Design an enzyme around this catalytic site. Sequence first.
Site, mmCIF file in Angstrom:
data_model
loop_
_atom_site.group_PDB
_atom_site.id
_atom_site.type_symbol
_atom_site.label_atom_id
_atom_site.label_comp_id
_atom_site.label_asym_id
_atom_site.label_seq_id
_atom_site.Cartn_x
_atom_site.Cartn_y
_atom_site.Cartn_z
ATOM 1 N N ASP B 84 -26.600 -44.506 82.341
ATOM 2 C CA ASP B 84 -27.423 -45.325 83.198
ATOM 3 C C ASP B 84 -28.041 -46.456 82.799
ATOM 4 O O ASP B 84 -28.343 -47.540 83.478
ATOM 5 C CB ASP B 84 -28.649 -44.394 83.772
ATOM 6 C CG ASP B 84 -28.331 -43.320 84.597
ATOM 7 O OD1 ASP B 84 -27.224 -43.239 85.361
ATOM 8 O OD2 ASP B 84 -29.142 -42.124 84.874
ATOM 9 N N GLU B 115 -31.835 -46.200 89.024
ATOM 10 C CA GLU B 115 -31.227 -45.786 87.647
ATOM 11 C C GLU B 115 -32.190 -46.060 86.566
ATOM 12 O O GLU B 115 -32.639 -45.409 85.479
ATOM 13 C CB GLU B 115 -29.942 -46.355 87.387
ATOM 14 C CG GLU B 115 -28.754 -46.149 88.524
ATOM 15 C CD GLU B 115 -28.455 -44.774 88.519
ATOM 16 O OE1 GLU B 115 -29.025 -43.888 88.073
ATOM 17 O OE2 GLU B 115 -27.228 -44.610 88.969
ATOM 18 N N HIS B 118 -34.227 -43.137 85.793
ATOM 19 C CA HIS B 118 -33.564 -42.014 84.729
ATOM 20 C C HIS B 118 -33.825 -42.678 83.482
ATOM 21 O O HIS B 118 -33.924 -41.873 82.521
ATOM 22 C CB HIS B 118 -32.212 -42.073 85.278
ATOM 23 C CG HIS B 118 -32.207 -41.551 86.569
ATOM 24 N ND1 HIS B 118 -30.845 -41.344 87.468
ATOM 25 C CD2 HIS B 118 -32.823 -41.412 87.699
ATOM 26 C CE1 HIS B 118 -30.900 -40.922 88.467
ATOM 27 N NE2 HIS B 118 -32.104 -41.045 88.749
ATOM 28 N N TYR B 122 -35.214 -40.430 80.255
ATOM 29 C CA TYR B 122 -34.607 -40.067 78.894
ATOM 30 C C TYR B 122 -35.522 -40.512 77.735
ATOM 31 O O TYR B 122 -35.643 -39.621 76.956
ATOM 32 C CB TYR B 122 -33.364 -40.644 78.843
ATOM 33 C CG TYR B 122 -32.388 -40.457 80.077
ATOM 34 C CD1 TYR B 122 -32.158 -39.259 80.769
ATOM 35 C CD2 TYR B 122 -31.675 -41.379 80.586
ATOM 36 C CE1 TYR B 122 -31.291 -38.790 81.651
ATOM 37 C CE2 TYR B 122 -30.768 -41.276 81.709
ATOM 38 C CZ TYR B 122 -30.588 -40.161 82.289
ATOM 39 O OH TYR B 122 -29.887 -39.658 83.364
ATOM 40 N N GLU B 204 -20.516 -41.383 88.274
ATOM 41 C CA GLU B 204 -21.565 -41.053 89.159
ATOM 42 C C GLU B 204 -21.280 -39.905 89.867
ATOM 43 O O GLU B 204 -22.198 -39.163 90.487
ATOM 44 C CB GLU B 204 -22.118 -41.887 90.174
ATOM 45 C CG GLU B 204 -22.771 -43.356 89.321
ATOM 46 C CD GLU B 204 -23.938 -43.860 90.235
ATOM 47 O OE1 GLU B 204 -25.017 -44.075 89.659
ATOM 48 O OE2 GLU B 204 -23.603 -44.594 91.149
ATOM 49 N N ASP B 237 -31.129 -37.806 92.988
ATOM 50 C CA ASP B 237 -31.050 -39.478 93.735
ATOM 51 C C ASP B 237 -29.546 -39.611 93.219
ATOM 52 O O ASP B 237 -28.983 -40.676 93.871
ATOM 53 C CB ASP B 237 -31.814 -40.001 92.638
ATOM 54 C CG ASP B 237 -33.259 -39.460 92.496
ATOM 55 O OD1 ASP B 237 -33.736 -39.216 93.466
ATOM 56 O OD2 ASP B 237 -33.715 -39.101 91.234
ATOM 57 N N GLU B 238 -28.855 -38.917 92.487
ATOM 58 C CA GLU B 238 -27.399 -39.298 92.229
ATOM 59 C C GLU B 238 -26.570 -38.781 93.216
ATOM 60 O O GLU B 238 -25.510 -39.661 93.479
ATOM 61 C CB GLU B 238 -26.800 -38.323 90.796
ATOM 62 C CG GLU B 238 -25.667 -38.984 90.393
ATOM 63 C CD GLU B 238 -25.954 -40.165 89.567
ATOM 64 O OE1 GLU B 238 -26.073 -41.325 90.250
ATOM 65 O OE2 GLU B 238 -25.466 -40.085 88.375
ATOM 66 N N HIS B 241 -25.919 -41.519 95.368
ATOM 67 C CA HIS B 241 -25.133 -42.558 94.871
ATOM 68 C C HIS B 241 -23.506 -42.633 95.087
ATOM 69 O O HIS B 241 -22.851 -43.460 95.722
ATOM 70 C CB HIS B 241 -25.412 -42.708 93.355
ATOM 71 C CG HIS B 241 -26.577 -43.051 92.836
ATOM 72 N ND1 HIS B 241 -27.078 -43.425 91.600
ATOM 73 C CD2 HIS B 241 -27.600 -43.843 93.950
ATOM 74 C CE1 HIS B 241 -28.409 -43.903 91.619
ATOM 75 N NE2 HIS B 241 -28.579 -44.168 92.797
#
Lengths: 356, 356, 150
Positions: B84, B115, B118, B122, B204, B237-238, B241
Amino acid sequence: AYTTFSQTKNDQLKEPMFFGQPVNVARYDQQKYDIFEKLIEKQLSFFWRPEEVDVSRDRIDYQALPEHEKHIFISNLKYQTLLDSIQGRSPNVALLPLISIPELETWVETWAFSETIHSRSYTHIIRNIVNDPSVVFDDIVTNEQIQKRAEGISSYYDELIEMTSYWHLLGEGTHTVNGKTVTVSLRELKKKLYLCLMSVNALEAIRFYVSFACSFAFAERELMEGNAKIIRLIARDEALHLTGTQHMLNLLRSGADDPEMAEIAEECKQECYDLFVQAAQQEKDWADYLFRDGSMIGLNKDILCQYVEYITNIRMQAVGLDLPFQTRSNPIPWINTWLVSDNSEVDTDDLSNFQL
Amino acid sequence: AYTTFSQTKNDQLKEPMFFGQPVNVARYDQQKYDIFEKLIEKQLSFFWRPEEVDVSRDRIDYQALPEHEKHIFISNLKYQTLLDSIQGRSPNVALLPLISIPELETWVETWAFSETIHSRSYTHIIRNIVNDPSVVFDDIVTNEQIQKRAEGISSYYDELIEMTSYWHLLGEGTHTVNGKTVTVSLRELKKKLYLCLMSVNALEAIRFYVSFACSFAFAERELMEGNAKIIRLIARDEALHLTGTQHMLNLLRSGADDPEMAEIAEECKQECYDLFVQAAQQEKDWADYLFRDGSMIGLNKDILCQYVEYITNIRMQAVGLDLPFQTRSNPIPWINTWLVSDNSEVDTDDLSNFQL
Amino acid sequence: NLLVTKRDGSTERINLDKIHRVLDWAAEGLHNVSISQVELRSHIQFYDGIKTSDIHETIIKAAADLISRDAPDYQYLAARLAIFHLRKKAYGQFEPPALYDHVVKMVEMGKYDNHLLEDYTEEEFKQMDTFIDHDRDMTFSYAAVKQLEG
Ligand SMILES: Nc1ncnc2c1ncn2[C@@H]1O[C@H](COP(=O)(O)OP(=O)(O)OP(=O)(O)O)[C@@H](O)[C@H]1O
């Protein structure tokens, strides 16, 4: 050469605002400039969806508001619509390739995203108060007042697009194609930035803030509520924007980050000053386009003009530029409402002694 | 030439997915492809801040989890961190200049912004479960497993950066600089896209979804809760994508939008198929790096590998590519939990008649 | 179209401009005084056949309400807007008539005592007219002005 990931392990802590090895990893454990990091957080918490605020009562309002007034509001809205429409992409192609530190990067994408919302909102408004969206949109693209500034600032971006592009696609000095010699000079690009950004401090500081006093004007008239409610939020999210445009300018002029730029700030001092004062005038004219048919119970050409001077006079005192417009007291103070944090003992003892 | 605002009034309705006059205005009154518009809305409503979910209980967890296991989790997290980190900028410099229609544009910036979150998350995790962020970060940049795929997909972006750049900075056919002739061919760019995006559908769709079964593995073990909670949202959310990466691919291959591309889809059919199947293998190896020291009570090299086949086998059946990996039944079904919508009459009458 | 009823009596269309110029006449030589402020303050409600006098009346009170410590001039601002109304509501026009002419006119009206027309000849009156500085009316602070109106 531009790399979506730089191979090298390079300590961001030292990477200049711009012109630095492209950010390898998205970390947030630290920053060189805490400012950017904060701008992101405060913005993230400011998140909001234009569909939230109701636009029903607003519909009938436009239908009622006089002609000389109807013009004022639909016209000034077209002006805002364009500003962000472009601003939305602009920060992303123009600056990203130049971004050199993590904190600043994340901010850019956020900064840009924030605008997309404003763009979406303006649309949510038009459908409510007008009968056809297209007719109003197709004009924001082909109109005489609109296009006149439209190309103005939008140019600085297209420039830093090609300029910065040759800096990667190609090296420095002279390369000749088809009998044409085009020079790429590092310093020749560090200026194509410092000037292109001073164009934003103005579009997001004075150009927009001026287009708000118009919308908030109907607010103090109990008209077009929904718009005022939405516009308020806009100004708030905007505050963060121009705020950063300055921190990016001040630190680039100080040299505490980019030593070279320290000089570019002097050989561009007059250069930037021109754009600021000059662009400011473009606004004063816009008023005529609105107050052409007639004035408004809230303000007219006279008033609105005074504002540009009061705002630009201070707006520039921050970046560090010289002050040209005459000093003044805000002609409109009623506007502040919208930029603030938007939602018996008796004795003979003591007597005996007195000697009347 | 790239313009942050195109002058021309051009009916977006017809502008191809890419390669079209740069979007003049940010409108939303209509769309050519309702898909993109929806992806934005659903995403906007999915908004969330990583700081929300608590990470306290997770801290002690890492301190307890065995060594062969500690490795598994800190290692797979480094892999996600990078994916990401790059994806964040990538969509924005690589695709934007090519964006030709409004709906698609707004989506891109949103897609990218999503992104950034994300990436921020992390970071919020590492600080909690580890003692020093840097030590873990500086490795995500300089590490033997990491760098090996890192450069792989990240290349497709850097390519469409220069390629597409010469298409604007310069015309077509041959231009020679310093004794070097570089060709720009329209079709030579329409492929540098169709291939570069099929690299994302995979990063993705299969590359990330595979890196989730690892994190959700500890979840079914009552370990590293916070991460699972955050990771879940990530996958959601991915979903949006890769969903778009397909709609962008399918319509570009159909020709219903870009007639020329219709052919490019056939002369690249085998080309894309290679990257998909090939890249898929890169993952199977990654497992060894985690299960090198030891297996996990939830899954080991054996299991995790089977997944890549099950997922990639279908993941490609969507884009339209051929199926290479053998058919299978999801080895892990327990993973679905995390991708679903994440938070008395008596008579002699009737008797008299019977004849026993 | 839009209508308005001039104090004169005749009708007119609304002239948003004419208002502004009036406030200006007041804001002249003042600071911290926002011409636009008073307008919005006043929530002046327009309706057909509204008398111009009433319209003017509205701003007077509005400007007087913005007389805050931070806005010391507003006290004088509204004062100027006030003096105007009065003079015109007693003279038909912004500039008062000669000492003599006036003194006499009001006499037969029962308002001024003829006692003066006898102790002073026209000459002496027209002479005293020199000492008279109508312009001194622009040296009043609205506080005092309002009292004069009664
Ligand atoms: N057409 C108009 N529309 C709105 N306001 C007006 C208009 N004309 C005058 N006014 C305002 O009302 C006030 C009254 O003006 P004034 O005392 O001079 O008497 P008037 O009857 O309006 O005579 P005149 O308008 O010719 O000056 C002024 O403040 C002026 O701004």
